[PDB]
Amino acid sequence: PLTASMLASAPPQEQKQMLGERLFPLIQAMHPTLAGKITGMLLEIDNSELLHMLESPESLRSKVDEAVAVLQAHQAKE
C-alpha cells in the first residue's frame, strides 16, 4: 500500500509520480481515454488530499467530475 509515511519518505517529484501512478488506473476505469489529462489536472492538488482520494472512491469521483468540467471550459476558451 501507499501509506502517508511511505509517501513522505520520497523526494517531492517522486511523490507526485507515485500519486499519479496510483491514481491513473482508478481514473482510467471511469474515463478510458481522458484519464491522462484528468490525472495531470489532479496532480496539482495537495499530496495529503490525493492520498485520501486513493482511499475514498466518492472523493475521487467528485474531483474527477470537477476536472472534466474544468477541461470542457478550457477547451472552449482555447
Binding site: 507526485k16 491514481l23 484519464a35 489529462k37 490525472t39 495531470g40
Partner: peptide, 16 residues
Amino acid sequence: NWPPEFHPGVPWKGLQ
C-alpha cells in the same frame, strides 16, 4: 499545452 498529461512510467511533464 494544458493540462500536462500523465503517461504511466513517463516522468510527469508537470514537474518543474
